[PDB]
Design an enzyme around this catalytic site. Sequence first.
Site, PDB file in Angstrom:
ATOM      1  CG  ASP A  82      -4.003   0.352 -15.349  1.00 51.50           C
ATOM      2  OD1 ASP A  82      -3.393   0.168 -16.419  1.00 51.50           O
ATOM      3  OD2 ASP A  82      -3.467   0.868 -14.349  1.00 51.50           O
ATOM      4  CD  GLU A 129      -2.520  -4.611  -8.533  1.00 53.19           C
ATOM      5  OE1 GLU A 129      -1.934  -4.199  -7.511  1.00 53.19           O
ATOM      6  OE2 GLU A 129      -3.579  -4.105  -8.967  1.00 53.19           O
ATOM      7  CD  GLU A 160      -4.346  -0.130  -1.650  1.00 56.15           C
ATOM      8  OE1 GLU A 160      -5.160  -1.069  -1.606  1.00 56.15           O
ATOM      9  OE2 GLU A 160      -3.995   0.415  -2.706  1.00 56.15           O
ATOM     10  CG  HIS A 188      -4.542   1.807 -11.172  1.00 54.42           C
ATOM     11  ND1 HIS A 188      -3.905   0.744 -11.786  1.00 54.42           N
ATOM     12  CD2 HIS A 188      -4.571   1.510  -9.846  1.00 54.42           C
ATOM     13  CE1 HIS A 188      -3.596  -0.164 -10.878  1.00 54.42           C
ATOM     14  NE2 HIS A 188      -3.978   0.279  -9.690  1.00 54.42           N
TER      15      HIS A 188
HETATM   16  N1  LIG Z   1      -5.063  -9.963   3.223  1.00 58.28           N
HETATM   17  C1  LIG Z   1      -5.944 -10.184   2.173  1.00 58.28           C
HETATM   18  N2  LIG Z   1      -6.549 -11.384   2.011  1.00 58.28           N
HETATM   19  C2  LIG Z   1      -7.397 -11.597   0.990  1.00 58.28           C
HETATM   20  N3  LIG Z   1      -7.689 -10.627   0.108  1.00 58.28           N
HETATM   21  C3  LIG Z   1      -7.058  -9.426   0.186  1.00 58.28           C
HETATM   22  C4  LIG Z   1      -6.158  -9.184   1.237  1.00 58.28           C
HETATM   23  N4  LIG Z   1      -5.700  -7.928   1.119  1.00 58.28           N
HETATM   24  C5  LIG Z   1      -6.265  -7.375   0.042  1.00 58.28           C
HETATM   25  N5  LIG Z   1      -7.088  -8.274  -0.505  1.00 58.28           N
HETATM   26  C6  LIG Z   1      -7.885  -8.155  -1.750  1.00 58.28           C
HETATM   27  O1  LIG Z   1      -6.957  -8.042  -2.848  1.00 58.28           O
HETATM   28  C7  LIG Z   1      -7.595  -7.409  -3.902  1.00 58.28           C
HETATM   29  C8  LIG Z   1      -6.634  -6.425  -4.547  1.00 58.28           C
HETATM   30  N6  LIG Z   1      -6.949  -5.773  -5.853  1.00 58.28           N
HETATM   31  C9  LIG Z   1      -7.418  -6.724  -6.887  1.00 58.28           C
HETATM   32  C10 LIG Z   1      -6.468  -7.807  -7.378  1.00 58.28           C
HETATM   33  C11 LIG Z   1      -6.873  -8.780  -8.520  1.00 58.28           C
HETATM   34  N7  LIG Z   1      -5.965  -9.865  -8.530  1.00 58.28           N
HETATM   35  C12 LIG Z   1      -6.675  -8.193  -9.898  1.00 58.28           C
HETATM   36  O2  LIG Z   1      -5.486  -8.161 -10.402  1.00 58.28           O
HETATM   37  O3  LIG Z   1      -7.660  -7.696 -10.500  1.00 58.28           O
HETATM   38  C13 LIG Z   1      -5.765  -5.029  -6.312  1.00 58.28           C
HETATM   39  C14 LIG Z   1      -5.021  -4.136  -5.373  1.00 58.28           C
HETATM   40  C15 LIG Z   1      -5.593  -3.336  -4.442  1.00 58.28           C
HETATM   41  N8  LIG Z   1      -4.609  -2.656  -3.740  1.00 58.28           N
HETATM   42  C16 LIG Z   1      -3.451  -3.155  -4.355  1.00 58.28           C
HETATM   43  N9  LIG Z   1      -3.747  -4.026  -5.326  1.00 58.28           N
HETATM   44  C17 LIG Z   1      -8.794  -6.739  -3.338  1.00 58.28           C
HETATM   45  O4  LIG Z   1      -9.885  -7.338  -3.978  1.00 58.28           O
HETATM   46  C18 LIG Z   1      -8.731  -6.956  -1.892  1.00 58.28           C
HETATM   47  O5  LIG Z   1      -9.997  -7.051  -1.242  1.00 58.28           O
END
Ligand SMILES: Nc1ncnc2c1ncn2[C@@H]1O[C@H](CN(CC[C@H](N)C(=O)O)Cc2c[nH]cn2)[C@@H](O)[C@H]1O
Lengths: 343, 343, 342, 343
Positions: free
Chosen positions: C31, C123, C132, C280
């Site tokens: 994205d 993010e 979520e 997305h």
């Molecule tokens: N409490 C938690 N403690 C530790 N980790 C967590 C927790 N909660 C969720 N996660 C993790 O965050 C990630 C969220 N996704 C990726 C983000 C990355 N910084 C990027 O910009 O590419 C995006 C995304 C998904 N939904 C919204 N944004 C995902 O790998 C989860 O397993």
Amino acid sequence: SVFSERTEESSAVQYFQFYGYLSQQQNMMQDYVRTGTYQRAILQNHTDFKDKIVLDVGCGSGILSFFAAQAGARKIYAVEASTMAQHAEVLVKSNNLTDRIVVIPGKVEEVSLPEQVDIIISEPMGYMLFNERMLESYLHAKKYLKPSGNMFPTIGDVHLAPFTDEQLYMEQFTKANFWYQPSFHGVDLSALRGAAVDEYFRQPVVDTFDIRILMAKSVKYTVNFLEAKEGDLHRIEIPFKFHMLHSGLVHGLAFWFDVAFIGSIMTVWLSTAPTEPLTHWYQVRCLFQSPLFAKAGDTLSGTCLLIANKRQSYDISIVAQVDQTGSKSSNLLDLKNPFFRYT
Amino acid sequence: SVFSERTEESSAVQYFQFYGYLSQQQNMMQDYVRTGTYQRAILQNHTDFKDKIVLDVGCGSGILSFFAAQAGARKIYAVEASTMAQHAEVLVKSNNLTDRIVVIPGKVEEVSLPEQVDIIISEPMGYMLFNERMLESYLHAKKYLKPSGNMFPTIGDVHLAPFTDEQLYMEQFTKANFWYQPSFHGVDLSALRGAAVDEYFRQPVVDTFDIRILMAKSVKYTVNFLEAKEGDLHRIEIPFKFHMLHSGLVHGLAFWFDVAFIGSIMTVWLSTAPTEPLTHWYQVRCLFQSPLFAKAGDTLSGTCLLIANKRQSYDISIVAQVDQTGSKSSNLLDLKNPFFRYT
Amino acid sequence: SVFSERTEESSAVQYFQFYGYLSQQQNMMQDYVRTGTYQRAILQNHTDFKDKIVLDVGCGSGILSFFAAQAGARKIYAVEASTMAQHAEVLVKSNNLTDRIVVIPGKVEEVSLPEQVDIIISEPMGYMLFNERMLESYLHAKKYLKPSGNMFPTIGDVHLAPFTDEQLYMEQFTKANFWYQPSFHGVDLSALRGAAVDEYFRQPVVDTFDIRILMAKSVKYTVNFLEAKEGDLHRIEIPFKFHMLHSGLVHGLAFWFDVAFIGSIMTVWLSTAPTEPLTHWYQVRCLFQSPLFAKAGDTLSGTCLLIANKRQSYDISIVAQVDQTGSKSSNLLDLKNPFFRY
Amino acid sequence: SVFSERTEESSAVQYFQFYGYLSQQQNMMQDYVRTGTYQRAILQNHTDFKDKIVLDVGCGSGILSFFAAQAGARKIYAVEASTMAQHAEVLVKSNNLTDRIVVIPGKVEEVSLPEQVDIIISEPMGYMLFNERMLESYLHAKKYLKPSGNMFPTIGDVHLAPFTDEQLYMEQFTKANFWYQPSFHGVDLSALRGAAVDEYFRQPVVDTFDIRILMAKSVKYTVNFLEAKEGDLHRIEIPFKFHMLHSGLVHGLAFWFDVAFIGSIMTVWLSTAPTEPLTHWYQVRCLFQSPLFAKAGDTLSGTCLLIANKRQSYDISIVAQVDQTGSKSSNLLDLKNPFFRYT
Ligand SMILES: Nc1ncnc2c1ncn2[C@@H]1O[C@H](CN(CC[C@H](N)C(=O)O)Cc2c[nH]cn2)[C@@H](O)[C@H]1O
Ligand SMILES: Nc1ncnc2c1ncn2[C@@H]1O[C@H](CN(CC[C@H](N)C(=O)O)Cc2c[nH]cn2)[C@@H](O)[C@H]1O
Ligand SMILES: Nc1ncnc2c1ncn2[C@@H]1O[C@H](CN(CC[C@H](N)C(=O)O)Cc2c[nH]cn2)[C@@H](O)[C@H]1O
Ligand SMILES: Nc1ncnc2c1ncn2[C@@H]1O[C@H](CN(CC[C@H](N)C(=O)O)Cc2c[nH]cn2)[C@@H](O)[C@H]1O
């Protein structure tokens, strides 16, 4: 009389008032397929009219009686129940035919004719052939027909075929969905939802369509006007078994009709089929409240039952089922409340 | 009854059958100017309703009675002669209002109410206000109104004004001249041309138009529903003197109407004028068979006489003359055969 | 922990399994509006990162931590609860950033960090911003934030607006009308029509649309991530009053969101509005079971109530009324069962 | 219970939540090949149902129990573990069958049923037949089956065949090569490319295809549900030897399944083969890590080993070799995480 015994006075008055307007006779006369085909049937079978005695049941403006006179009829009794009878009289005089066309005002069930006739002519067809119940008057008139006399038209064929039309279905369901509202200006209408769906889906749809919506070859139901009795049309049972040519949703049955003028010289057909040029009868579609799924090769069987009522119309029940699955639809049609969809 | 004595049975049966369809109630309900203005009139004048006794004449779906209940009415007698009464009753129960709205099936001329009321509400207006003659039922109902009781609507204003529309006028001859042919399929129709012209010109034209066709400020004729008696509507004489603002040919008179809800808090107006958003009433035009030339500053004077008939409509007589020239036109119209022209 | 107490085990397991797939991380990385805007936010505000201590909440592949390193961060703790943590570590080593990015496996609610941080990046946005419930994890993480530290993103704006879309409405009504059949293979289903309508209309519709379907200017609800508490997101009450710009049927409310990165050099916005290029997240529409009629100039008033649930989603309640007529609608939706229409 | 001991709770929760949706029941119901064939199997073998005791394992909406009732079953026990049980009960009541169908909420492994049955009906088939492990619940239910009883379906045939699909194979690398770039926004992603390839190849591909990609007649593995024990499905070793009908590169194995209803009157087949109209099961393809070249006339031999796991699915181990050349390949796939490729 036989007419008043089967007809609510309320219905009869409005009915003959409607046909007393010149604008309405004009609309019919300007259907060139209709008027031209009647003229062809009569003139091309002129020997069936030459020096004969004719009865025109429901003569309107008199147009069919003029055709019988062109074909050489000796005497034509032109019966008309509406005030149009007086306009017909005017045309008989202005066309110098006072010695051959005799207008007799009144209902054909109630008037007196001086003699029996060789042939009866009429245009008694309504929507879906039977609407308005004028075929009963046409058959009643046979009390004046000589044995071995003829009827023009002689037979009527009703055609039925299943169709698919999602858009039509959704159009009617959209209107009904008004009664689903729980807060129309603060008022909960939703308890009438069922009544509204029922009502809209009881409306026969009058318009034309592309023949590609038809999902099976039509089934034909024939009425022979030479043989049928008036009472036969009080209960009309039309069985059908369609062999589905395409898979899909069946949203209802489409109806149209042909009549044949079986003369001594030739048979002339007037068709309102969707494969033919458009007439003022268009075609008629019943909708199912719930469409039926069928695949090509399945059979769709059932009956269309028309039960005559006092409003010169019919209570219609259509029951259809997909034989292989038992999926069944039972429907009512209120021929008194058509939806004129054509634009 | 007073109703059965002024109405041919045939007309009455078809009339109430029409209002028995949910689709027809829906059509009225969906006129937002109509339904919304009634709600506003009733809610913004809540002191005319709070803890009051109400009569709803011709309640249809019950919608106005629900508005009365929203405004706090103690009891609403909702009278309806069509089979729609049964559906209103379903909605009263489903909206939990059985203790405050009582549906009374029947004609308001024939039913009995258990007590006198503070206010009568109704939507009895037809084309050019008076068509269908339901205003007589509304006035008749005042036999149940307490002294000093109120009527909603309180007054009705019919507006008339001269118009120019050459294309609308010429259209009548285009249609009528169908009959001016010496060989329609071999038939000389020409003797009926005059009768056809007369018939088309007897039809009031229901549709809307651009206000620039209007040639003078309208004249207003007011019916005060608080003061008027039912018999006042059997013969309505509307004199007029138009001061012409534009020069040209006057082809007829255009009609529209307003009603006012004169409440204790404020007066609310419902207008079907051509300067306002369209309603299901459109506007109505009555053609002169012979148009009149008038110059700006001339005066056009005469009378419109509406005579009630037993088909729940009016025979209309319009006589007009240009005072400065003496040129005169006289016309007869039948409000029961309007020509619905709107597209 | 705070996470396990608000989260059903069934949901948490499947949730972090989902993000353990490289294919899923790839989809998010691709994205370009999302990833590119995050990189611009961080690099153009390089002074908020230069020689700073950073926490990346839910680092996934590590991509935001790499942006933080590009912008000159001294040390970045990259916390990730799924097995993607091990893939992030592989990339930290292969990019020779072991001296600056420290992957911390586990939930941000449960791990220990050696020190407080200057700035938190994440993010955490889902459908309709809040789906979520990861914003709660983001806010929780402020226990590691130095006083006056910053948050990237800093604020989140939820937008709501009434829309008209007869075809979408009838599409869903059509699906439900299956349960109206009185003779499906000979079986009468109709007693379930009500239940079916309720079920289908409880599904928020995820897709995009033409902006001309919007019938009023949007109402905005703002969450300030610097000030907000985790508990603030358990029950979110959004009042609204729309001034109708067009007359017609309102079939429901459309939702989207923006986030702003309020840095020392500039404020950078990431928008999922229908006036902006598609992301997305698409947009989300909540349908009314019955549309409301309104005229231009009317006001449509009510409340959108978002109640966080134990399946990491929201129970949605929308009540709306046309003030001038008293026409009212109440609706309940389950954001855990969206209809992906795109 | 037997179910809870073989199933991870997280999986069971999501699994039965999924089937509690009417939309998911509708999706299966609207699969006309599926629903119509069950109906046909049951009705055309009516002597297997008339006056019989029936058990419906996993009744969903109850649809198969209604078919059993159409065929004259005296009593039907309909077991359903999801909240759909409550909707099935509504349909039983509304279809006036409370005297013949009893809905038992719960898992068939856990509920109590009072008596032995003549015949068990069920639709427990998943992708590649075995996915979801519901066939074990079906076999488990034979603890309620009389020794002289029947099973509908009676047998299940899983089919395997080698395929060539260069584009499908290349697609895995096109996707995985996203990671093979040194500066994705400044980041070298290349170290994860192998892991990405491995991940994509572990996913069975659910979609349909042209039968011309198939390179040999399928090998059939039959589970006879009348004879088999639930434990027979914990480890399913499917040897295969394909007689290659076409020369080319073999990229993997395609899977589909048939079930047969072996009744007293006739045997009815339900097929999900790529030679038949598409069903909601599509077909399934498992790629080889490395394609194998084979000539028409060569033999491709090996084993597909399905090892049940506690996520209600299977680990698929495939070893294959071209006997004439000794070229060998394998794959290990996770059926719980299929890639839905179909467009
Ligand atoms: N409490 C938690 N403690 C530790 N980790 C967590 C927790 N909660 C969720 N996660 C993790 O965050 C990630 C969220 N996704 C990726 C983000 C990355 N910084 C990027 O910009 O590419 C995006 C995304 C998904 N939904 C919204 N944004 C995902 O790998 C989860 O397993
Ligand atoms: N029992 C009755 N006794 C006397 N007259 C009757 C009776 N019943 C109906 N009518 C009259 O028949 C006319 C039917 N319409 C015109 C036919 C004309 N021959 C022509 O071809 O133009 C056609 C038509 C319309 N709908 C169906 N056919 C109409 O003027 C009715 O008032
Ligand atoms: N003597 C009578 N006794 C009892 N009932 C009568 C009588 N006469 C007519 N009616 C009934 O009034 C209704 C009129 N139409 C609906 C009004 C409804 N209150 C609404 O505002 O939506 C409006 C309307 C129609 N045309 C003009 N206004 C209609 O249902 C008729 O059957
Ligand atoms: N151990 C169990 N005890 C009790 N019930 C169970 C169990 N296991 C699964 N189920 C239920 O069976 C249903 C299977 N699906 C619907 C079948 C329906 N007879 C029809 O033909 O339309 C079909 C289907 C789906 N996937 C494969 N077949 C589904 O409602 C499950 O919740």
